Amino acid sequence: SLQLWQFLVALLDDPSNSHFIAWTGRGMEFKLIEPEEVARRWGIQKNRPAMNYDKLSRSLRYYYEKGIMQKVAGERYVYKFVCDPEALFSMAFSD
DNA sequence: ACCGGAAGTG
DNA sequence: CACTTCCGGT
């Protein structure tokens, strides 16, 4: 019963996943080094074996409207977590 | 690579 | 709600 942003926060945390997903170090900026593996892993997690990066990125793109995160434009596969009071309350509650 | 729209699924 | 699917479009 995991949300995508929560699933990524978990993978991102340990450096055992440094080869496919990691923090840029420029704040909450994070890049999906190997997007199809991040996609593969999200798929096994939700038992959606059809998961690829085009589907996973739509769900990340839905996070733009939620205020939780936004694209780090100009840097391929790099996204960032929005650090504002609206996003803190969006992440400290679910339906 | 990256962006929605729109329908559909738990 | 929170995605998933699956396009069309730039």
Numbering used by the authors: 334 to 428
Question: Which text from the study accompanies this structure?
Answer:
Two additional charged residues, Arg-381 and Arg-409, appear to be in position with the potential to interact with the phosphodiester backbone; the former occupies a position between the two DNA strands in the region of the minor groove narrowing, and the latter could potentially form an additional salt bridge in longer DNA sequences. On an individual residue level, the most striking transitions can be seen to occur in the recognition helix α3, where in Etv1 Asp-387, Arg-391, and Arg-394 can be seen to become ordered upon DNA binding and Tyr-395, which can be seen to switch between the two alternative rotamers found to be important for recognition of bases downstream of the GGA motif in the Fev-DNA complex. Somewhat surprisingly, mutants in residues involved in salt bridges to the DNA backbone (Lys-379 and Lys-404) exhibited no detectable DNA binding. Overall, the mutational analysis demonstrates that the residues interacting with the DNA backbone in the crystal structure are the major contributors to the binding affinity in solution, although the interactions with the bases add a significant but lower energetic contribution. We were able to reproduce the inhibition of DNA binding by specific phosphorylation of Ser-334, a known PKA target site, in the isolated Ets domain in vitro.
The Ets domain is a variant helix-turn-helix (winged helix) structure, comprising three α-helices and a four-stranded antiparallel β-sheet. Furthermore, a new Ets dimerization interface linked by a redox-sensitive disulfide bond is identified, and this dimerization is shown to result in a significant inhibition of DNA binding, potentially linking Ets transcription factors with cellular redox regulatory mechanisms.
